[PDB]
Ligand binder design. Structure first.
Ligand SMILES: CN1C(=O)[C@@](c2ccsc2)(c2cccc(-c3cccnc3)c2)N=C1N
Length: 371
């Protein structure tokens, strides 16, 4: 039941949310990053200075080698390993066990994070971006095929809210929608294509002010929803215009562009934080109806990430828009794979001050925005 999935995620600010899983027989307990921005179930399977535990295939009576390697380079870093299958469960998830593909990472560069407390990665996106190719069934595909779990999951990412990185908590509800996790209406935007969880943004506003761009710029070359990115990441042209508008709303009080550049923290002390001077930001996502859209509106509390010190959690992108955790933390997000759509609703874990609230509001009519 869904009650038992509530609060089944943890993590440290900036270091991703993870869910406890078990792999093999007897069950090996690993914390696994919940990542909607990739499609491989891949787990540390050998000693690494940042890992205090890892998947030992040889200790699993139910392991099966696929005798096939996989190498996954990416911008920041890389990982490589050896493919197999084994029984997998999520203790605080559905009460089922599945035989899933598992990439046992044997080597890796700048992949694991010091102190993050996860040992692996649960790629929840689609086969199309799976490595080494699209024939390696992703975990969720296996789960749905092998069980009667409905082809849907939802993420309520809560952040930290009020020496060591703040802890975050959240819930990953698999196989349904938990009504206690949100208030108000759920609004849906179509998954444009089943690879990433790709969506379309049709408009963005900073404190009500339209950035007035060709909406193609918002989705250049794609816009995705990615729990495995911390930041709201924007294409260059949009980032610049965004930060411009933001710098203006908060003109009273100045910061070094080290801050705006997302590598330099700024601090007030104990509750002096002037949330009020930072503007809300609305992303309008395409509706299920051609000419409709709806907006999700996010507060400075979500895009200033605590490190009272914060880092600016909007950053520039050369690979399109990424609606990462700081955007998702306002909301209850439904990855309705079965109806090919992503719904958004105001989250029960509401990090709002007494003047503003994150919001999901629609419809808005917009009378072509994709790559
Ligand atoms: C953007 N992204 C990645 O770089 C990553 C990926 C997956 C396969 S290769 C790259 C990845 C790998 C390792 C760590 C993290 C990460 C770090 C901090 C916070 N949250 C996630 C993300 N998953 C996504 N979506």
């Amino acid at each position: 039941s869904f009650v038992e999935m509530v609060d089944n995620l943890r993590g440290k600010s900036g270091q991703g949310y993870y869910v406890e899983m078990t792999v093999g027989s007897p069950p090996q307990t690993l914390n696994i990053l919940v990542d909607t921005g990739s499609s491989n179930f891949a787990v540390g399977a050998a000693p690494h200075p940042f890992l205090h535990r890892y998947y030992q295939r040889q200790l699993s009576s139910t392991y099966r080698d696929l005798r096939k390697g996989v190498y996954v380079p990416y911008t920041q870093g890389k990982w490589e390993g050896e493919l197999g299958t084994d029984l997998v469960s999520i203790p605080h998830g559905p009460n089922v066990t599945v035989r899933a593909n598992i990439a046992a990472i044997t080597e890796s560069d700048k992949f694991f994070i010091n102190g993050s407390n996860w040992e692996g990665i649960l790629g929840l996106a689609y086969a199309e971006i799976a490595r080494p190719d699209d024939s390696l069934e992703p975990f969720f595909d296996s789960l749905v095929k092998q069980t009667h779990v409905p082809n849907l999951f939802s993420l309520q990412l809560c952040g930290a809210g009020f020496e060591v990185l703040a802890s975050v908590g959240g819930s990953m509800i698999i196989g349904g929608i938990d009504h206690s996790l949100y208030t108000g209406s759920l609004w849906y935007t179509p998954i444009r294509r089943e690879w990433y969880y790709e969506v379309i943004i049709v408009r963005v506003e900073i404190n009500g002010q339209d950035l007035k761009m060709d909406c193609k710029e918002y989705n250049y070359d794609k816009s995705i929803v990615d729990s495995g990115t911390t930041n709201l990441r924007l294409p260059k042209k949009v980032f610049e215009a965004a930060v411009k508008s933001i710098k203006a709303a908060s003109s009273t009080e100045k910061f070094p562009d080290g801050f705006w550049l997302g590598e330099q923290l700024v601090c007030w002390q104990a509750g002096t934080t002037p949330w009020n001077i930072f503007p809300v930001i609305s992303l309008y996502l395409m509706g299920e109806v051609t000419n409709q859209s709806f907006r999700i509106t996010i507060l400075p509390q979500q895009y200033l990430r605590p490190v009272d010190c914060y880092k600016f959690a909007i950053s520039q992108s050369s690979t399109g828009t990424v609606m990462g955790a700081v955007i998702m933390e306002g909301f209850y997000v439904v990855f309705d794979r079965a109806r090919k759509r992503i719904g958004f609703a105001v989250s029960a874990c509401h990090v709002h001050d007494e003047f503003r609230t994150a919001a999901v509001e629609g419809p808005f009519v917009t009378l072509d925005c994709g790559y």
